[PDB]
Amino acid sequence: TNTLTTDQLQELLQIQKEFDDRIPTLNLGDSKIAYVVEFFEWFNTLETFKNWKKKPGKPLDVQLDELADILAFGLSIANQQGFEEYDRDLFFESFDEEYFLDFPYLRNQDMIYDMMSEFYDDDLTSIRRLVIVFKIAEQLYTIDQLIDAYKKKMK
Amino acid sequence: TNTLTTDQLQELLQIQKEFDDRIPTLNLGDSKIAYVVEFFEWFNTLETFKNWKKKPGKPLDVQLDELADILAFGLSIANQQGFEEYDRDLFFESFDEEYFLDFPYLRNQDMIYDMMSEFYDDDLTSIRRLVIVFKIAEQLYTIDQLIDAYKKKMKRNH
């Protein structure tokens, strides 16, 4: 129904934790950088700046597979910083409140400047990274489509 | 074979011009976004943040082909704004002056944050965009390898 429950979120955090447990070299600095790199890879699949293309936008399954990479690093960063009940409650409060990240904006190629703006601020929260990826799923795709692409990626 | 001459630069601007002349929808705003997206595509090929891979890094030819995309949009942005002898001289002056962009710096995955801080600056210049890509070529690769990858790219694009 295009909603995210705390149960779903905790399940996703558990799947990432099990994946990341197999990486003894895991570190927050690298994971935060990968999130930004994967964001740009996803943004590139939208092709909203590619005026030279007749039919802009990669296939939906390709856009979703790239969105799922962002989700993976967002979940990982949240696990690595610690993501407990306190953090979930903040996430859902922010997520329900958030109205800036809607369909037309995300379609506007200029949004990438607002994202970079957030990404080089060292104080960006694990909450914010997850709000962004789920809002993109909720407004441009569905949450279920993203969760499906993520689970496929992880198995 | 790791130097850039004004003859070489004028030649690259002319190649980009001939390509872009064939794109009736060309616009500067989209080209400035494309430069940044392609910068990140190239940075992803280094894999310097991928501690979970044993031997990180895409093939050298893949790295150079992505570096050449950055060069293409930097040349395009320069051409679209107007880039005359006056600007070429300022470019070479900057390029020669540039000493922050060295092998150790580019090596460091944290460098992307410094790049982002330039990319989100509305006042980022066309000269600076070209200094960045040619310095990356000079320091991590060679300028000649970048030019060669770019010229091939532009022949496959027509």
Residue numbers in the entry:
A (entry chain A): 2 to 156
B (entry chain D): 2 to 159
Wording from the paper:
Some Staphylococcus aureus phages encode dimeric instead of trimeric Duts, which are completely unrelated at both sequence and structural levels. The crystal structure of the ϕDI Dut described here represents the first structural characterization of this group of dimeric Duts, revealing particular features. Remarkably for unrelated proteins, our results indicate the de-repression mechanism used by dimeric and trimeric Duts is conceptually identical, involving dUTP as a second messenger turning off Stl-Dut interaction.
To validate this idea, we obtained the three-dimensional structure of ϕDI Dut in apo form, allowing us to compare this with the dUPNPP bound structure. The apo ϕDI structure showed a dimeric organization that, surprisingly, presents a “closed” conformation almost identical to the dUPNPP-bound form. This was confirmed by the minimal differences observed when both dimers were superimposed (RMSD of 0.36 Å). The major differences are observed at the C-terminal helix α8, where electron density is poorly defined for the apo structure’s last fourteen residues, indicating that the region is highly flexible. Similarly, the last five residues of helix α8 of the dUPNPP-bound structure present poor density, confirming the high intrinsic mobility of this region. Oppositely, the binding of the nucleotide seems to have minimal conformational effect in the ϕDI Dut, which presents a “closed” conformation in its apo state. Therefore, the absence of the major part of the mobile C-terminal portion, which also provides several phosphate interacting residues, would explain the fixed closed conformation observed for the ϕDI Dut.
